[PDB]
């Protein structure tokens, strides 16, 4: 009971985007891909609200490999990209993340989106109130107390230290001078100086970073024009506008 | 009361095809939609989507007036405010 649109050519780049709107990211990016690269695949929801056939629901790679590959299953797609809107699908990260880790351990482009403001008991000497707020995850309001464990393999916490950590374990002490793989950053719409302040303690800058915060923040409720020019800002950050 | 199944639960815009799985995947389950239940009267909730609504219309307290049951077009405020 889902509707998904797709059409892949030679396994150029398949990219899954999960309910966009119309704004300045599709104006820079669309003449980017354009002259960059050709052929490339457009796959996007559709709005459901009546049953049809299946539903896709990420799943919907494996199909591919299960339906045009029937012969034979040698491997699926290794860069796998996740697009979408901020708002809380929890149930469609747990299955990606899930799907991603069980498929392919060492991916090279990874994006967390829809990161929760919330962190989870991790000690840092950032601020005094850091560590207070930090194991609190209530930020004015957050009854998800037993969402909270789950979101780190279903939402993807702004604590990137504790969230490899805390999966593959194998993080040291000294996280400096780590930069190799791909990796965005989409959420933390209150805190946002959580990324920066743990993005920079390690001063560490990979191949391909990109960071793109909202505003759920009073100042942003209650300033709204602050809200609108910093996503002016940040739509013009790669390009700006003649 | 009144939590049959409704024989009326439709997304009108794709948006709110993911209402369904944050609120009515756990919270409902019941098989409810927009005919006036215990969630459609508002509440306080039981997720984080709470914190979008109460940081948004700027301490609700009590109700949660002028945040979601006031524009039937979630879709013009997404592509304003994320």
Redesign the interface.
């Known amino acids: 009971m889902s509707q998904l649109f797709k059409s892949f050519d030679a396994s150029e780049k398949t990219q899954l985007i999960c ?1 966009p ?3 300045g990211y599709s104006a820079s990016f669309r003449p980017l891909h354009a002259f960059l690269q050709g052929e490339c695949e457009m796959l996007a ?6 049953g049809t056939n299946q539903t896709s629901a990420i799943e919907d790679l494996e199909e591919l490999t299960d339906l045009y590959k029937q012969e034979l299953n040698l491997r699926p797609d290794r860069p796998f990209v996740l697009f979408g ?8 990260f747990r299955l990606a993340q899930k799907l991603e880790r069980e498929g392919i351990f060492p991916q090279a482009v990874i994006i967390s989106a829809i990161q ?3 962190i989870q008991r991790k000690k840092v000497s950032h601020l005094p109130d850091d560590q207070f707020l930090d194991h609190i995850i209530q ?6 107390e ?2 909270e464990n789950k ?1 780190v393999m279903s939402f993807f916490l702004p604590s990137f230290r504790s969230d490899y950590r805390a999966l593959e374990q194998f993080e040291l002490y000294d996280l400096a001078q780590i930069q190799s793989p791909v990796h965005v950053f989409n959420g933390l ?2 805190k946002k100086c959580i990324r920066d302040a743990e993005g920079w303690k390690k001063w560490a800058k990979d191949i391909t970073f990109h960071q793109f915060d ?5 100042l ?3 300033t ?1 024009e602050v ?2 020019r910093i ?1 002016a800002i940040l739509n013009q950050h790669p390009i700006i506008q003649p | 009361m009144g939590v049959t199944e409704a024989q009326y639960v439709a997304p009108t815009n794709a948006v709110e095809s993911k209402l369904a799985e944050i609120w009515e995947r756990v919270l409902g389950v019941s098989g409810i939609g927009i005919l006036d239940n215990f969630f459609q009267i508002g509440g306080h909730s039981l997720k984080a989507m709470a914190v979008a609504a109460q940081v948004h219309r700027e301490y609700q307290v009590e109700l949660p007036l002028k945040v979601l049951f006031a524009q039937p077009t979630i879709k013009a405020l997404a592509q304003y405010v994320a």
């Open positions: 309910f709107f119309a704004g929801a559709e709005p459901p609200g009546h809107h901020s708002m809380g699908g929890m149930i469609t929760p403001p919330h930020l004015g309001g957050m009854p998800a037993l969402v979101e719409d209150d909202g505003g759920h923040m009073f942003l409720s209650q709204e809200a609108e996503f």
